[PDB]
Each structure stands twice: as structure tokens, then as C-alpha cells.
Design a binder for this molecule. Structure first.
Ligand SMILES: Nc1nc2c(ncn2[C@@H]2O[C@H](COP(=O)(O)OP(=O)(O)OP(=O)(O)OP(=O)(O)OP(=O)(O)OC[C@@H]3O[C@H](n4cnc5c(=O)[nH]c(N)nc54)[C@@H](O)[C@H]3O)[C@@H](O)[C@H]2O)c(=O)[nH]1
Length: 220
């Protein structure tokens, strides 16, 4: 009935980029744990307050806290098509997911470390606004500064080479049971390469099997 789709891959792999193309071609919003984590911190909710207790201590917010805030969001979006970016991260989150839907489509992105490192080295942000500047696509009008405020741009910690390598290894270690699970159900589609542009046509085709591509009024 409603679509239940998932895009997985290590940080830097282009999950956000693919989700954005899916929005422009299908009108399908994507849902991510980081985005819902932000939203809960801004609203100062009970789960937001739990996450902040970890963050204040420079601790990773545990998977179970993320499962909690994600299931709560999905359980309140039961009449919507879902496109999940990077969730489930773990086998236990995949199983949590199983209780409230049947996952139709899983896209896995396998991108070499060198590409990950080179993509993320080219990303800068304006931290207060969260405006993101990809230097190969949308660089700031003036070098080093935000387009509105002219305040200096920052490189996110996770975007630096050592952090990129650490996060890739963290991903590899956790990803295998999740990919195996969806592989045995026949819903997993795996893509490798260095260019999102080259992977996109295959992903497009998979979504158009499930939901109608948007066309313009005068395309008839
Ligand atoms: N336990 C726990 N888990 C968490 C927590 N928060 C989030 N999680 C999640 O951990 C996730 C990792 O999430 P993250 O929020 O820390 O980071 P992530 O969603 O992996 O974001 P990234 O922005 O690092 O990666 P991604 O969305 O895959 O990349 P993006 O599409 O933004 O591309 C990166 C750059 O490459 C560029 N790009 C893309 N394709 C190409 C291309 O073809 N060519 C070039 N030159 N550039 C390209 C883009 O313009 C972009 O600048 C798991 O899956 C869970 O969802 C948490 O607090 N605790």
C-alpha cells in the first residue's frame, strides 16, 4: 500500500543526496534519526533531554534512545509513505521496525573510503543556521563565510579525515547483520561506485515501480 523504503550506507555515501532526488522526482519526504534528534532537542522533549545528557558528557547518544525517538515518529506517520535515511542502523532497530510495517525496498550504498573522505572534505556549514555548502555544487558567494550573515563557515567534526575513517569502520562492523537480514527477504538492492549521478538511474527505476513519478501540468 504505502511505500516503506530505506536508504543505507556509511556517512558520506550520498544517502541525503539520493533522498533529495527522490523528493524532486516523487514528492516523497525523507526521515532521518539526526533530523528527529535535532527536532527533539529544540522542543526540549523527554527523549531530547535524555539525548542532551549524553551530549553534555561528550557521549554517543545510544542506539536505544534513537530507536525510541524514531519509532515514536513513525508510529505517528502511519498514513504516510516512509523513506528512511540511515535507519535501521542495527539489527535491533530493524526488528523494532518490523512490528509496525513491512519494509518494501532497501537501497544500500557502497562507496570507497577515498571518495567518502574527498566528498566530506568539501563540505562546510554555518552552524547556527545549519546552512550547508558543498563546495563542488553550491559554494558560498564569498569564500569562507555564510551567504546571509557573513559569519565564518565551519567543517563538522565528522567531516574530517580521521573521523571519516573511524565512522566508516563503525558502519562496517554494524551494517553486516542488517544487510544480511534484508538480503534474505529479497528486498535489498546494492549499489557501488564513486558517483551518485551514475547510481541514480537505477534507484529511480526502483522507486517508479512502487510510486508514480511526478510530471508537469503541460507535459500532459
Ligand atoms: N547511536 C546513534 N546513532 C545515530 C545518532 N544520530 C544519528 N544516528 C544515526 O547514525 C547514522 C549516521 O548518521 P549521521 O546523522 O551521523 O550522518 P549521516 O546520515 O550518515 O550523514 P552524512 O551527511 O555524513 O552522509 P550522507 O547523507 O550519506 O551523505 P550526503 O548525501 O549528504 O553526501 C555527502 C557529501 O557528498 C556530496 N556528494 C554526494 N554525491 C556526490 C557525488 O557524486 N560527487 C561529489 N563530488 N559529491 C557528492 C554531497 O553534496 C555532500 O556534501 C545511522 O544510520 C543512524 O541513523 C546518534 O546520536 N546516536
Amino acid at each position: 500500500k504505502l511505500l516503506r523504503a530505506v536508504i543505507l550506507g556509511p556517512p558520506g555515501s550520498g544517502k541525503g543526496t539520493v533522498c533529495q532526488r527522490i523528493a524532486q522526482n516523487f514528492g516523497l519526504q525523507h526521515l532521518s534519526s539526526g533530523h528527529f534528534l535535532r527536532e527533539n532537542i529544540k522542543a526540549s522533549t523527554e527523549v531530547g533531554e535524555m539525548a542532551k545528557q549524553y551530549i553534555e558528557k561528550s557521549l554517543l547518544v545510544p542506539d536505544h534512545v534513537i530507536t525510541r525517538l524514531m519509532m515514536s515518529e513513525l508510529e505517528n506517520r502511519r498514513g504516510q509513505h516512509w523513506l528512511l535515511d540511515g535507519f535501521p542502523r542495527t539489527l535491533g532497530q530493524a526488528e523494532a521496525l518490523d512490528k509496525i510495517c513491512e519494509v518494501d525496498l532497501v537501497i544500500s550504498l557502497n562507496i570507497p573510503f577515498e571518495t567518502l573522505k574527498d566528498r566530506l572534505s568539501r563540505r562546510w556549514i554555518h552552524p547556527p543556521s545549519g546552512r550547508v555548502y558543498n563546495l563542488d555544487f553550491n559554494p558560498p558567494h564569498v569564500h569562507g563565510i555564510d551567504d546571509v550573515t557573513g559569519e565564518p563557515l565551519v567543517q563538522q567534526e565528522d567531516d574530517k579525515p580521521e573521523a571519516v575513517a573511524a565512522r566508516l569502520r563503525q558502519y562496517k562492523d554494524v551494517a553486516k547483520p542488517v544487510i544480511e537480514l534484508y538480503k534474505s527477504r529479497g528486498v535489498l538492492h546494492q549499489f557501488s561506485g564513486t558517483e551518485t549521478n551514475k547510481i541514480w538511474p537505477y534507484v529511480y527505476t526502483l522507486f517508479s515501480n512502487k510510486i508514480t513519478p511526478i510530471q508537469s501540468k503541460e507535459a500532459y
